[PDB]
Amino acid sequence: MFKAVLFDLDGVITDTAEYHFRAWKALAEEIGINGVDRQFNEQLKGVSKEDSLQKILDLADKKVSAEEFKELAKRKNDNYVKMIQDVSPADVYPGILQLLKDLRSNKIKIALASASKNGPFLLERMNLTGYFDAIADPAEVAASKPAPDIFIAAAHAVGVAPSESIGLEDSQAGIQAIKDSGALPIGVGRPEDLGDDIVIVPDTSHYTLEFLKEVWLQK
Ligand SMILES: O=P(O)(O)OC[C@H]1O[C@@H](O)[C@H](O)[C@@H](O)[C@@H]1O
Numbered sequence: 001m002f003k004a005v006l007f008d009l010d011g012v013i014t015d016t017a018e019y020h021f022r023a024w025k026a027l028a029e030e031i032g033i034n035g036v037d038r039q040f041n042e043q044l045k046g047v048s049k050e051d052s053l054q055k056i057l058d059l060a061d062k063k064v065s066a067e068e069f070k071e072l073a074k075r076k077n078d079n080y081v082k083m084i085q086d087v088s089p090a091d092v093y094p095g096i097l098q099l100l101k102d103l104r105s106n107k108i109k110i111a112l113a114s115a116s117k118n119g120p121f122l123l124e125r126m127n128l129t130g131y132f133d134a135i136a137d138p139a140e141v142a143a144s145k146p147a148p149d150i151f152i153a154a155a156h157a158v159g160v161a162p163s164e165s166i167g168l169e170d171s172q173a174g175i176q177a178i179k180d181s182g183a184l185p186i187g188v189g190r191p192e193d194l195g196d197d198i199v200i201v202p203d204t205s206h207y208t209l210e211f212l213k214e215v216w217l218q219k
């Protein structure tokens with residue numbers, strides 16, 4: 001049986017992937033880049049703030065100064081941080097609170113493997129911090145998603161091997177990171193976005209301890 005679950009935050013715990021998308025699209029349009037639509041945004045999910053901005057600039061083969069790059073990233077963050085102030089426990093996705101409770105009752109470790117530096121603040125907004133045994137700090141990894149480092153760190157932070165862990169993700173980059181960590185991925189979203197080669201559930205209500213067991217027994 002698995003000994004840890006490694007949670008992505010945005011698009012897994014709550015609908016903040018939507019807010020990252022809206023904030024990045026707004027930023028892109030301010031600088032005359034109009035290609036950040038929902039399809040393109042699948043390439044941005046799970047990706048760090050700086051890598052996200054660079055992918056957007058690349059889309060237009062646009063170059064900005066180092067000073068402008070810093071300011072643009074800060075502008076997007078300031079906007080996103082204002083968007084999330086009213087997040088509350090009511091915004092926790094279906095099934096997630098119960099899963100956290102059931103994992104703890106079964107002595108299964110819980111770790112956060114979010115790329116977001118705003119992750120701790122969001123867990124506090126949602127009254128979830130006390131469920132987490134560890135938060136892997138994305139500022140401390142040498143390499144960001146789709147590199148596996150954040151998932152490896154999360155597992156190690158709770159004293160469990162990645163190979164004894166499940167990772168929950170909504171993103172292409174994050175699914176790849178889980179795969180390369182050695183943990184077992186279960187995605188949430190559309191196979192057209194996340195692939196047909198791992199277990200994918202259509203919504204977070206499917207993330208029951210019963211189902212994670214159903215999946216683990218068959219890997
Ligand atoms: O700018 P932050 O809060 O550090 O977030 C970094 C990344 O966090 C990830 O969780 C999101 O999927 C990305 O969309 C986001 O860019």
Ligand SMILES: [Mg+2]
Nearest residue numbers: 008010011170
């Ligand atoms: Mg995500």
Ligand code: NA
Nearest residue numbers: 026029030034
């Ligand atoms: Na406009």
